[PDB]
Amino acid sequence: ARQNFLGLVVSQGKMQKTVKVRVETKVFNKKINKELFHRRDYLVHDEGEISREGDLVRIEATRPLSKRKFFAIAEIIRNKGQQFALYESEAQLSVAKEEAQKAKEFLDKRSVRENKLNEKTTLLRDIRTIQDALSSGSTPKELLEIKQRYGIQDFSQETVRQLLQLDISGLEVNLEKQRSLIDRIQTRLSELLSNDLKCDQFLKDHGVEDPLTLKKNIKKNLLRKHVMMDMQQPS
Amino acid sequence: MGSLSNEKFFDISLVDSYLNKDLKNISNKIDSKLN
Amino acid sequence: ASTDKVDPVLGRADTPFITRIMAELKEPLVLSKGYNIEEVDKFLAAIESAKRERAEL
Amino acid sequence: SSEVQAACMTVRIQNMANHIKEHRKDFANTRNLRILVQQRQAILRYLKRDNPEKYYWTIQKLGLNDAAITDEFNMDRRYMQDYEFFGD
Amino acid sequence: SLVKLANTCAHLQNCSKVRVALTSIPYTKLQLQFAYNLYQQGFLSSLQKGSTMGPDKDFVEVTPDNISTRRLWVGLKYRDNKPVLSSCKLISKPNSRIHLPMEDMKKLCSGVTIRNIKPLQPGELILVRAHNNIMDINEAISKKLDGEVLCRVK
Amino acid sequence: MSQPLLRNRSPEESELLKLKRNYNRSLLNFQAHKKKLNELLNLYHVANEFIVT
Amino acid sequence: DSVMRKRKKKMKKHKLRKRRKREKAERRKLS
RNA sequence: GGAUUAAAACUAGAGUAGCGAAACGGAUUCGAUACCCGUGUAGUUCUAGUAGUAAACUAUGAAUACAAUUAUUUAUAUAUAUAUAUAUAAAUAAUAAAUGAAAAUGAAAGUAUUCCACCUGAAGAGUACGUUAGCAAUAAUGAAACUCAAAACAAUAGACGG
Ligand SMILES: [K+]
Ligand SMILES: [K+]
Ligand SMILES: [K+]
Ligand SMILES: [K+]
Ligand SMILES: [K+]
Ligand SMILES: [Mg+2]
Ligand SMILES: [Mg+2]
Ligand SMILES: [Mg+2]
Ligand SMILES: [Mg+2]
Ligand SMILES: [Mg+2]
Ligand SMILES: [Mg+2]
Ligand SMILES: [Mg+2]
Ligand SMILES: [Mg+2]
Ligand SMILES: [Mg+2]
Ligand SMILES: [Mg+2]
Ligand SMILES: [Mg+2]
């Protein structure tokens, strides 16, 4: 049959309807006693100009098409070259949109900081008026303004404590919950495995059919999936 | 002592108990006990 | 000569990502060592408030 | 991730390039800059093979192009003169 | 990896020279098949799975969590003040792999130097890899298999 | 010889592994954050001795 | 190579340098 | 392919104490274009460049896996009846094995694997010619003819040593 080769497109878009394909064949080199790969670039006809640099293609022998062209593209085995072209165009649009959004979020942050620098009022001073007015009874209009600078309509000892909250405090509680879950899951499964009877019951209670007839790994995974379905789904 | 310390140069325990309603929920607790 | 000659070291001039990060480092109240001014103002106010509460117990 | 590594290298490359522009005789740190730029090329070349979509997105955001990444680069004297690294 | 196999063959030679009774090799399928053939052929006293610190006494399932710390532990044999496993060399090298048809393997076992491979000697073991299985050359000839001539052990 | 060379992690094992690893990274970040605040507190205590006016 | 053998190369280099100085001088007068 | 690259040297502009090719003198000597002494120019210094060479040496390319000991430091870690002790690495020194023409190497010059550079008798010769590069000195590349049966290394025993 017609001689067919597999190769990588190494040049495209330089000649009209012609691409350069790199074909590698296996040969034996008697001198060094080693089976080597021999490489050759083929000028190949691309009637539809579909192939792109980087594509893996199969080329088939044809009639003479020019001084040096004797093969044509017969199939695109892998279209990595075509993918490269599509992803580059999308990237330009995708990145422009993201950069526009980030540029607007930077100017907004700058405006807020500039606005705050125009308000001579300071947190410490404001928190020293909400704690003196709340301990003296005075209600100068500054407080009403302070009830707008911060949004704190009510001036109580439990409102300054909520104006000065630090994110670290929230992190400290999320971390304790995370540690609890892991510790509970491990103790639960550890105990369950120690008692085969309580384990068999555990599985049946959660909806396993004849858990007794199961393997150690085929069933410990069920136990693990259940212990993690009784401490993460209920919570 | 932590939050309930007498040192002039205290640690972050005191500031944490304040923002966690502990130095206040203990002051009331002690006072309620005194009552 | 019509090729897109992009500096392989510094990249295209006026890249929005490069410029914005540079600008952020030169903002008025940027702090070092991982501190942010907003967290430092609340923390310093909390110290004062916390001291008053410890002086009211 | 390769995209993060390239971005982190970009920051250091930008800082080191600024140093070199003021210390054009500091060949020790010029060599360090060259190696770092080549390291960034290496990580991005792998990214193009591993996740082409992310690759093209990353280089566009960093201000580079495919040629800057694939082509052999030595940051040699001709580069310093063709891109006016030191100015005048 | 043929490189890993080369490392193991050299390692066994080094251990034999000093006459250590027990040593470890990397934990991989190829290494395990290689060691198992040596064990069945009487070159190794023992073959145990284990860790970086020693052979396992009780079965330890291998998983991604501990794969990096796994090792294969092999016992070397010595009789009459001579090592049983004196030499261990690759035939098919990383930079020059040798694939032979069953016809050429029969010539190699018959005294004919094929592709510069010295023929099989009395009491020597030549291993062949076919479809990712390692077997003695005589067994490959029995199964009419063509394969890569990996190494020779004496 | 018949034993499989490697047993892949079950989906559940990978979930518990990710929980521990996320916890490890979060705990270290928190401990560094708290250390920095404790240094900011000890610097506030001495800033009365520093001159800015 | 030993010092003894190095000395043979040393002599050849000296004679080449001596000849090139001699040629230079001539060029100066002939120029 | 690129970059950097001692000393000498070169192109400009500064500097010039001391040192110091050369040169001119003083000695020594049978002679002394030397060794020693004097006066001491270039140079040695700085700035901006050219050039890319050294016994540029460990005369030993880089990477990886691995093999028997001791000593001594260093580092990290651990413990305590708190200052040592126990661990794991690195460096250095002396070694086993192994290798080697031997001298010796010693974690490589050992056991192996991968990649690069390089060699194929002496002399002619790193010369000639050409080419490329440089302001230049030069640098890189780099032969053949003729002639010979030499030529070289480690080690041994002598002889000799102002
Ligand atoms: K035609
Ligand atoms: K090269
Ligand atoms: K001078
Ligand atoms: K030296
Ligand atoms: K090399
Ligand atoms: Mg690299
Ligand atoms: Mg030599
Ligand atoms: Mg001058
Ligand atoms: Mg003199
Ligand atoms: Mg130069
Ligand atoms: Mg020279
Ligand atoms: Mg040289
Ligand atoms: Mg030197
Ligand atoms: Mg390296
Ligand atoms: Mg020359
Ligand atoms: Mg000798």
UniProtKB/Swiss-Prot annotation, chain B:
Can you tell me where the transmembrane regions are?
none
Q: Which family does it belong to?
A: Belongs to the mitochondrion-specific ribosomal protein mS26 family.
Additional detail: Present with 2010 molecules/cell in log phase SD medium.
Which portion of the entire protein is included? 266 to 300 of 318
Quaternary organization: Component of the mitochondrial small ribosomal subunit (mt-SSU). Mature yeast 74S mitochondrial ribosomes consist of a small (37S) and a large (54S) subunit. The 37S small subunit contains a 15S ribosomal RNA (15S mt-rRNA) and 34 different proteins. The 54S large subunit contains a 21S rRNA (21S mt-rRNA) and 46 different proteins.
Q: Where is the signal peptide?
A: none
Which locations, inside or outside the cell, does it occupy?
A: Mitochondrion
Q: What does this protein do?
A: Component of the mitochondrial ribosome (mitoribosome), a dedicated translation machinery responsible for the synthesis of mitochondrial genome-encoded proteins, including at least some of the essential transmembrane subunits of the mitochondrial respiratory chain. The mitoribosomes are attached to the mitochondrial inner membrane and translation products are cotranslationally integrated into the membrane.
- What is the protein name given in its UniProt record? Small ribosomal subunit protein mS26
Swiss-Prot record, chain C:
List the signal peptide residues.
none
The entry's localization annotation reads:
Mitochondrion
Q: How is it modified after translation?
A: The precursor is processed in two steps involving mitochondrial intermediate peptidase (MIP) and mitochondrial processing peptidase (MPP).
Function of the molecule: Component of the mitochondrial ribosome (mitoribosome), a dedicated translation machinery responsible for the synthesis of mitochondrial genome-encoded proteins, including at least some of the essential transmembrane subunits of the mitochondrial respiratory chain. The mitoribosomes are attached to the mitochondrial inner membrane and translation products are cotranslationally integrated into the membrane.
Family per record:
Belongs to the universal ribosomal protein uS15 family.
What more is known? Present with 6960 molecules/cell in log phase SD medium.
Its assembly, as annotated, is: Component of the mitochondrial small ribosomal subunit (mt-SSU). Mature yeast 74S mitochondrial ribosomes consist of a small (37S) and a large (54S) subunit. The 37S small subunit contains a 15S ribosomal RNA (15S mt-rRNA) and 34 different proteins. The 54S large subunit contains a 21S rRNA (21S mt-rRNA) and 46 different proteins.
What's this protein's name?
Small ribosomal subunit protein uS15m
Taxonomic source organism: Saccharomyces cerevisiae (strain ATCC 204508 / S288c)
From Swiss-Prot, chain E:
Per its record, what are the GO molecular function terms? structural constituent of ribosome
Compartment list = Mitochondrion
A Gene Ontology biological process noted in the UniProt record is: mitochondrial translation
Task: Give UniProt keywords alphabetically.
Answer: Mitochondrion, Ribonucleoprotein, Ribosomal protein
| A Pfam family recorded for this sequence | Ribosomal_S8
Q: Which GO terms describe its cellular component?
A: mitochondrial inner membrane; mitochondrial small ribosomal subunit; mitochondrion
- Subunit structure, interactors included: Component of the mitochondrial small ribosomal subunit (mt-SSU). Mature yeast 74S mitochondrial ribosomes consist of a small (37S) and a large (54S) subunit. The 37S small subunit contains a 15S ribosomal RNA (15S mt-rRNA) and 34 different proteins. The 54S large subunit contains a 21S rRNA (21S mt-rRNA) and 46 different proteins.
The entry's function note states:
Component of the mitochondrial ribosome (mitoribosome), a dedicated translation machinery responsible for the synthesis of mitochondrial genome-encoded proteins, including at least some of the essential transmembrane subunits of the mitochondrial respiratory chain. The mitoribosomes are attached to the mitochondrial inner membrane and translation products are cotranslationally integrated into the membrane.
Q: Which family does it belong to?
A: Belongs to the universal ribosomal protein uS8 family.
State what protein this is by name.
Small ribosomal subunit protein uS8m
Q: Which organism is it from?
A: Saccharomyces cerevisiae (strain ATCC 204508 / S288c)
The taxonomy runs: Eukaryota, Fungi, Dikarya, Ascomycota, Saccharomycotina
From Swiss-Prot, chain G:
Role: Component of the mitochondrial ribosome (mitoribosome), a dedicated translation machinery responsible for the synthesis of mitochondrial genome-encoded proteins, including at least some of the essential transmembrane subunits of the mitochondrial respiratory chain. The mitoribosomes are attached to the mitochondrial inner membrane and translation products are cotranslationally integrated into the membrane. mS38 is also involved in the splicing of the COX1 mRNA.
Location of this fragment in the whole protein = 78 to 108 of 111
- Ranges for region Disordered: 5-31
Say which family it is in.
Belongs to the mitochondrion-specific ribosomal protein mS38 family.
Give compartment(s). Answer: Mitochondrion; Mitochondrion inner membrane
Q: Where is the composition biased (Basic and acidic residues)?
A: 23-31
Domain of life of the source: Eukaryota
Subunit info here reads: Component of the mitochondrial small ribosomal subunit (mt-SSU). Mature yeast 74S mitochondrial ribosomes consist of a small (37S) and a large (54S) subunit. The 37S small subunit contains a 15S ribosomal RNA (15S mt-rRNA) and 34 different proteins. The 54S large subunit contains a 21S rRNA (21S mt-rRNA) and 46 different proteins.
Q: What is this protein called?
A: Small ribosomal subunit protein mS38
